[PDB]
Amino acid sequence: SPLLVGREFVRQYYTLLNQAPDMLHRFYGKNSSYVADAVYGQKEIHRKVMSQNFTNCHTKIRHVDAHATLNDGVVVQVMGLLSNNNQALRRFMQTFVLAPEGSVANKFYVHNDIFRYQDEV
Amino acid sequence: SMVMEKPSPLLVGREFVRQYYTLLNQAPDMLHRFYGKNSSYVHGGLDPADAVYGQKEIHRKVMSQNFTNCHTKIRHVDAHATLNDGVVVQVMGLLSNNNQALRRFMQTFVLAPEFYVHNDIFRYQDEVFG
């Protein structure tokens, strides 16, 4: 189901951001966009993730919406709080587009990942 | 006669958002024209409330929300190309309905050619945070 795919991915994503952000790049493909200008593909997305120096990253997910979208994809909207380097929690919204990976059944990859802190808006 | 290069996803998103919120204030009874049979729609609410699917149910949900004299302050719009010529839009702003409180919201759209809205996810921050 789209909500199970969505909520399970969100759990995996923010857990990996805390445990091993150097492995976050495994979610993305050649044409993935990570968003400030967008960076594309695993190599550049990995470099951008590493440049953000994620350390002891704590997350409180307040709500997840996930719906079936174009070409068997899943669109996910996350609302929550994120802390980095033991600084205060900051509210954010995050939009993901999950797309079928195309070579393994029920496997998805992250086609779009758009994050914005609400205090910066 | 002039032919112009197709607009970038960012200005497709920005133009869509300007049109959507102009219509929400001017004629909310016309908002359903953006949606199709497989489109998803959710605009906050607490039982967070569940989404409705398809044009007929979207029109009825929009009419039940009684949008009148809507005021919107769009603080940020992000938009990027997505699957099969689509555009994913992230919107952050403030919305006041019927001269009530200006409420912060977080919204996502998925637009697809013929652009129409495939997904519309809207949530008020005050129904999710605190």
- Of B119, B112, B84, nearest to B12 (Cα)? B112
CATH of the domain at B71: 3.10.450.50
Question: Domain containing A8: what range?
Answer: 1-121
Domain count, chain B: 1
Distance of CA A114 to the CA centre of its chain: 8
Given a contact cutoff of 8 angstroms between Cβ atoms, the answer to whether B42 and B108 are in contact is no
A100 HSE (CA, 13 A, CB side): 12
Please list every residue in chain B followed by a chain break, i.e. its C lies more than 2.5 Å from the next written N: 47, 114
Instruction: Round the CA-based radius of gyration of chain B to a whole number and report it.
Output: 15
- Residue B125 tokens read as 């921050």
Distance CA B4, CA A49 (A): 36
Flag if A65 and B76 touch (Cβ within 8 Å).
no
Q: How far is A66 from chain B (nearest CA, A)?
A: 9
Experimental technique used? X-ray
Dihedral of CA B118/A104/A32/A81: which sign?
Answer: positive
The partner residue sitting opposite B82, judged by closest CB among A35, A93, A97, is A97
Residue A49 DSSP code: H
Distance CA B83, CA A97 (A): 8
The partner residue sitting opposite B108, judged by closest CB among A70, A73, A75, is A75
Chain B contact present for A86, CB below 8 A: no
Flag if B121 and A35 touch (Cβ within 8 Å).
no
Given a contact cutoff of 8 angstroms between Cβ atoms, the answer to whether B112 and B38 are in contact is no
What own/partner pairs with CB < 8 Å and gap ≥ 24 does B36-43 have?
A: B36/B116, B36/B118, B38/A68, B38/B118, B39/B116, B39/B117, B39/B118, B39/B119, B39/B120, B40/A67, B40/A68, B40/B118, B40/B119, B40/B120, B40/B121, B41/B120, B42/A65, B42/B120, B42/B121, B42/B122, B42/B123, B43/B120, B43/B122
Given a contact cutoff of 8 angstroms between Cβ atoms, the answer to whether B28 and B62 are in contact is yes
b/e sequence A72-109, b meaning 16+ C-beta within 10 Å:
ebbbbbbbbbbebeeeeeebbbbbbbbbbeeeeeeebb
Distance CA A41, CA A53 (A): 19
Q: In what order do the strands lie in the sheet with A58-68?
A: A39-40, A28-34, A108-117, A90-100, A74-83, A58-68
Beta bridge partners of A114: A95
Instruction: Round the CA-based radius of gyration of chain A to a whole number and report it.
Output: 14
Instruction: Compute how many other C-beta atoms are within 10 angstroms of the C-beta atom of residue B71.
Output: 15
For this entry, resolution in Å reads 1.7
